Amino acid sequence: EGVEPAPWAQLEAPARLLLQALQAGPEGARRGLGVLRALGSRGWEPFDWGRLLEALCREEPVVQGPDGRLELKPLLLRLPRICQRNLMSLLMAVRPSLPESGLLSVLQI
């Protein structure tokens, strides 16, 4: 009935860890940088932002408003509200090394 899986469940594990990390309140943002350096450290030294920025726009269905209304929300609006504000904070922090087409799709959301 009320079990909800985490909406980042289906992503490449590194992204899952990043988004898990940002969840943890206002010191959530800082942690993200430690996560990115702690994946520069591991076997996959580059981090494939283009895939996370695709996956952040992908849509799934939700039922909000009255009781019944089918709507399509991208990921960025569906994951927890402190993760949103600390994601966009960490993109503000690392803008230069991001592909613009993806970034723009996110801002479009």
Partner 1 sequence: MAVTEASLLRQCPLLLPQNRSKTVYEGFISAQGRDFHLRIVLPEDLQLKNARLLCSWQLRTILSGYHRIVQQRMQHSPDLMSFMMELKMLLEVALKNRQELYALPPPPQFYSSLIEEIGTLGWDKLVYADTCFSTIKLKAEDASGREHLITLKLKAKYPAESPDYFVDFPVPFCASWTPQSSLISIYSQFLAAIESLKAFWDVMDEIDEKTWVLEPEKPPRSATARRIALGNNVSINIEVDPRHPTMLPECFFLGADHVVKPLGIKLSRNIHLWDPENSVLQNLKDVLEIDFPARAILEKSDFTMDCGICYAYQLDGTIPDQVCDNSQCGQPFHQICLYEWLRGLLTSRQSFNIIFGECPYCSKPITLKM
Q: Which of 1, 2, 65, 70 binds partner 1 (CB under 8 A)?
A: 70
Per-residue binding letters, 21-50, with partner 1 (x by CB under 8 A) = x--x-----xx--x--xx-xxx--xx-x-x
Q: How many CB atoms lie within 10 A of CB 54?
A: 16
For residue 39, the minimal CB distance to partner 1 (Å) is 9
Length of the chain, please?
Answer: 109
Does 12 participate in binding partner 1 (rule CB under 8 A)? no
Parallel, antiparallel, or unpaired: how do β-strands 59-63 and 70-74 relate? antiparallel
Q: 102 near 50, Cβ under 8 Å?
A: yes
Does 65 participate in binding partner 1 (rule CB under 8 A)? no
Tokens of 18: 């990043």
Phi, psi of 44 (to 5 degrees): -105, 80
Please identify, among the stretches 5-13, 75-83, 85-93, the one whose residues bind partner 1 according to the rule CB under 8 A.
5-13
Does 58 participate in binding partner 1 (rule CB under 8 A)? yes
